[PDB]
Design a protein around this motif. Structure first.
Motif, PDB file in Angstrom:
ATOM      1  N   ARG A   1       0.583   9.232  -6.171  1.00  0.00           N
ATOM      2  CA  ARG A   1       1.160  10.398  -6.064  1.00  0.00           C
ATOM      3  C   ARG A   1       1.787  10.995  -7.621  1.00  0.00           C
ATOM      4  O   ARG A   1       1.550  12.305  -7.897  1.00  0.00           O
ATOM      5  N   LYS A   2       2.736  10.200  -7.912  1.00  0.00           N
ATOM      6  CA  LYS A   2       3.223  10.659  -9.317  1.00  0.00           C
ATOM      7  C   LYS A   2       2.167  10.850 -10.401  1.00  0.00           C
ATOM      8  O   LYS A   2       2.357  11.675 -11.168  1.00  0.00           O
ATOM      9  N   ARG A   3       0.983  10.003 -10.500  1.00  0.00           N
ATOM     10  CA  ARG A   3       0.057   9.921 -11.471  1.00  0.00           C
ATOM     11  C   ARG A   3      -0.802  11.416 -11.183  1.00  0.00           C
ATOM     12  O   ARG A   3      -1.008  12.257 -12.476  1.00  0.00           O
ATOM     13  N   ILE A   4      -0.963  11.924 -10.164  1.00  0.00           N
ATOM     14  CA  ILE A   4      -1.437  13.119 -10.178  1.00  0.00           C
ATOM     15  C   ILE A   4      -0.702  14.450  -9.588  1.00  0.00           C
ATOM     16  O   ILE A   4      -1.350  15.538  -9.202  1.00  0.00           O
ATOM     17  N   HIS A   5       0.620  14.191  -9.928  1.00  0.00           N
ATOM     18  CA  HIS A   5       1.677  15.188  -9.577  1.00  0.00           C
ATOM     19  C   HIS A   5       1.579  15.874  -8.275  1.00  0.00           C
ATOM     20  O   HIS A   5       1.767  17.079  -8.008  1.00  0.00           O
ATOM     21  N   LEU A   6       1.343  15.091  -7.260  1.00  0.00           N
ATOM     22  CA  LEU A   6       1.590  15.409  -6.121  1.00  0.00           C
ATOM     23  C   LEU A   6       3.205  15.149  -5.428  1.00  0.00           C
ATOM     24  O   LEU A   6       3.661  14.032  -5.908  1.00  0.00           O
ATOM     25  N   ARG A   7       3.508  15.986  -4.541  1.00  0.00           N
ATOM     26  CA  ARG A   7       4.904  15.746  -4.062  1.00  0.00           C
ATOM     27  C   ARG A   7       4.965  14.793  -3.293  1.00  0.00           C
ATOM     28  O   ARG A   7       3.985  14.577  -2.563  1.00  0.00           O
ATOM     29  N   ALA A   8       6.169  14.146  -2.757  1.00  0.00           N
ATOM     30  CA  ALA A   8       6.452  13.329  -1.702  1.00  0.00           C
ATOM     31  C   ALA A   8       6.009  13.946  -0.343  1.00  0.00           C
ATOM     32  O   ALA A   8       5.565  13.371   0.432  1.00  0.00           O
ATOM     33  N   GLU A   9       6.219  15.237  -0.310  1.00  0.00           N
ATOM     34  CA  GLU A   9       5.713  15.970   1.036  1.00  0.00           C
ATOM     35  C   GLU A   9       4.276  16.282   1.061  1.00  0.00           C
ATOM     36  O   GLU A   9       3.780  16.928   2.223  1.00  0.00           O
ATOM     37  N   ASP A  10       3.555  15.919   0.003  1.00  0.00           N
ATOM     38  CA  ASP A  10       2.179  16.331  -0.128  1.00  0.00           C
ATOM     39  C   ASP A  10       1.224  15.184   0.737  1.00  0.00           C
ATOM     40  O   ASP A  10       1.550  14.077   0.213  1.00  0.00           O
ATOM     41  N   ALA A  11       0.259  15.448   1.440  1.00  0.00           N
ATOM     42  CA  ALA A  11      -0.597  14.475   2.060  1.00  0.00           C
ATOM     43  C   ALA A  11      -1.231  13.635   1.175  1.00  0.00           C
ATOM     44  O   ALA A  11      -1.838  14.383   0.325  1.00  0.00           O
TER      45      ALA A  11
ATOM     46  N   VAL B   1     -10.759   2.732   2.135  1.00  0.00           N
ATOM     47  CA  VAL B   1     -11.677   1.443   1.768  1.00  0.00           C
ATOM     48  C   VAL B   1     -12.467   1.466   2.620  1.00  0.00           C
ATOM     49  O   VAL B   1     -12.431   1.101   3.889  1.00  0.00           O
ATOM     50  N   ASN B   2     -13.816   1.417   2.273  1.00  0.00           N
ATOM     51  CA  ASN B   2     -15.031   1.538   3.085  1.00  0.00           C
ATOM     52  C   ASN B   2     -14.793   2.469   4.389  1.00  0.00           C
ATOM     53  O   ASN B   2     -15.129   2.287   5.240  1.00  0.00           O
ATOM     54  N   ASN B   3     -14.332   3.671   3.950  1.00  0.00           N
ATOM     55  CA  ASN B   3     -14.070   4.834   4.847  1.00  0.00           C
ATOM     56  C   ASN B   3     -12.984   4.680   5.890  1.00  0.00           C
ATOM     57  O   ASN B   3     -12.621   5.501   6.612  1.00  0.00           O
ATOM     58  N   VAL B   4     -12.239   3.382   5.829  1.00  0.00           N
ATOM     59  CA  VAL B   4     -11.195   3.300   6.771  1.00  0.00           C
ATOM     60  C   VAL B   4      -9.778   3.422   6.094  1.00  0.00           C
ATOM     61  O   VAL B   4      -9.749   2.743   4.806  1.00  0.00           O
ATOM     62  N   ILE B   5      -8.867   3.909   6.679  1.00  0.00           N
ATOM     63  CA  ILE B   5      -7.357   4.146   5.958  1.00  0.00           C
ATOM     64  C   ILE B   5      -6.710   2.650   6.139  1.00  0.00           C
ATOM     65  O   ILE B   5      -6.576   2.442   7.174  1.00  0.00           O
ATOM     66  N   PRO B   6      -6.220   2.306   5.099  1.00  0.00           N
ATOM     67  CA  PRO B   6      -5.373   0.926   5.073  1.00  0.00           C
ATOM     68  C   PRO B   6      -3.953   1.105   5.603  1.00  0.00           C
ATOM     69  O   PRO B   6      -3.383   2.202   5.598  1.00  0.00           O
ATOM     70  N   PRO B   7      -3.585   0.098   6.275  1.00  0.00           N
ATOM     71  CA  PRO B   7      -2.084   0.270   6.761  1.00  0.00           C
ATOM     72  C   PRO B   7      -1.164   0.132   5.450  1.00  0.00           C
ATOM     73  O   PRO B   7      -1.368  -0.556   4.594  1.00  0.00           O
ATOM     74  N   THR B   8      -0.007   0.935   5.486  1.00  0.00           N
ATOM     75  CA  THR B   8       0.971   1.117   4.347  1.00  0.00           C
ATOM     76  C   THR B   8       1.705  -0.248   4.473  1.00  0.00           C
ATOM     77  O   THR B   8       2.243  -0.433   3.106  1.00  0.00           O
ATOM     78  N   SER B   9       2.014  -0.888   5.188  1.00  0.00           N
ATOM     79  CA  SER B   9       2.848  -1.998   5.363  1.00  0.00           C
ATOM     80  C   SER B   9       1.735  -3.387   4.635  1.00  0.00           C
ATOM     81  O   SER B   9       2.523  -4.309   4.326  1.00  0.00           O
ATOM     82  N   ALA B  10       0.580  -3.219   4.321  1.00  0.00           N
ATOM     83  CA  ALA B  10      -0.052  -4.368   3.742  1.00  0.00           C
ATOM     84  C   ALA B  10       0.213  -4.428   2.225  1.00  0.00           C
ATOM     85  O   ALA B  10       0.484  -3.632   1.621  1.00  0.00           O
ATOM     86  N   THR B  11       0.369  -5.593   1.679  1.00  0.00           N
ATOM     87  CA  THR B  11       0.303  -5.629   0.309  1.00  0.00           C
ATOM     88  C   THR B  11      -1.087  -5.204  -0.272  1.00  0.00           C
ATOM     89  O   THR B  11      -2.136  -5.501   0.480  1.00  0.00           O
TER      90      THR B  11
ATOM     91  N   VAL C   1       0.831  -1.201  -0.108  1.00  0.00           N
ATOM     92  CA  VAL C   1       0.020  -0.007  -0.142  1.00  0.00           C
ATOM     93  C   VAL C   1       0.781   1.260   0.173  1.00  0.00           C
ATOM     94  O   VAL C   1       0.773   2.246  -0.801  1.00  0.00           O
ATOM     95  N   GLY C   2       2.121   1.151   0.917  1.00  0.00           N
ATOM     96  CA  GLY C   2       2.872   2.159   0.804  1.00  0.00           C
ATOM     97  C   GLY C   2       3.578   2.742  -0.450  1.00  0.00           C
ATOM     98  O   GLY C   2       3.542   3.909  -0.963  1.00  0.00           O
ATOM     99  N   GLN C   3       3.849   1.707  -1.383  1.00  0.00           N
ATOM    100  CA  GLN C   3       4.233   1.841  -2.777  1.00  0.00           C
ATOM    101  C   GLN C   3       3.224   2.400  -3.548  1.00  0.00           C
ATOM    102  O   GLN C   3       3.561   3.388  -4.431  1.00  0.00           O
ATOM    103  N   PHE C   4       1.976   1.775  -3.221  1.00  0.00           N
ATOM    104  CA  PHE C   4       0.924   2.337  -4.222  1.00  0.00           C
ATOM    105  C   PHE C   4       0.733   3.947  -3.949  1.00  0.00           C
ATOM    106  O   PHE C   4       0.114   4.757  -5.028  1.00  0.00           O
ATOM    107  N   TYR C   5       0.616   4.276  -2.869  1.00  0.00           N
ATOM    108  CA  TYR C   5       0.830   5.674  -2.371  1.00  0.00           C
ATOM    109  C   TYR C   5       1.469   6.598  -3.389  1.00  0.00           C
ATOM    110  O   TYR C   5       1.168   7.478  -3.639  1.00  0.00           O
ATOM    111  N   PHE C   6       2.891   5.797  -3.498  1.00  0.00           N
ATOM    112  CA  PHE C   6       3.745   6.771  -4.315  1.00  0.00           C
ATOM    113  C   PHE C   6       3.620   6.754  -5.771  1.00  0.00           C
ATOM    114  O   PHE C   6       3.882   7.644  -6.637  1.00  0.00           O
ATOM    115  N   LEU C   7       2.788   5.635  -6.244  1.00  0.00           N
ATOM    116  CA  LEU C   7       2.498   5.578  -7.465  1.00  0.00           C
ATOM    117  C   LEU C   7       1.470   6.602  -7.803  1.00  0.00           C
ATOM    118  O   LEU C   7       1.497   7.094  -8.923  1.00  0.00           O
TER     119      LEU C   7
END
Length: 129
Positions: free
Chosen positions: A78-88, A93-103, A70-76
């Motif tokens: 971010r790149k598609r929508i031109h967000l910086r790494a420093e940008d939130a 998923v069903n209103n709940v934020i998933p853990p970044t360490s999950a695959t 999930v953490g890697q997907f965040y960066f993927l």
């Protein structure tokens, strides 16, 4: 360990255009086919939360490597929508934020809908709206 946990009520208030535009049986047929054809990926629908003031994603069926975190997907994304790494950026998923360490495969198995897609909303804010 007193780690932070971003908790929320489970809910299904997000209207995904992919669902609005295709009947369940069409989605399910397609999801089933995709899971068979690409067994080392999971099919994901990713759409911006309604009130989020950030870039939109292309309307695609995103087939994501099951071992990507999930953490890697965040960066993927971010790149598609031109967000910086420093940008939130937050996923829901069903209103709940998933853990970044999950695959993504783990996330898919836990949360995919009966049409065999996983649905992810995204926002620049940590509370869905």
């Amino acid at each position: 360990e007193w780690g932070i946990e971003l908790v929320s009520e489970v809910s299904e208030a997000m209207g995904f255009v992919y669902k609005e535009e295709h009947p369940f049986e069409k989605r399910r047929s397609e999801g089933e086919k995709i899971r068979k054809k690409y067994p080392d990926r999971v099919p994901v629908i990713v759409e911006k939360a309604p009130k989020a003031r950030i870039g939109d994603l292309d309307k695609k069926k995103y087939l994501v490597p099951s071992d990507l975190t999930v953490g890697q997907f965040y960066f993927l994304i971010r790149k598609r929508i031109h967000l910086r790494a420093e940008d939130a950026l937050f996923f829901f998923v069903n209103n709940v934020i998933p853990p970044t360490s999950a695959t993504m495969g783990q996330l898919y198995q836990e949360h995919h809908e009966e049409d065999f897609f996983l649905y992810i909303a995204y926002s620049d804010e940590s509370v869905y709206g």
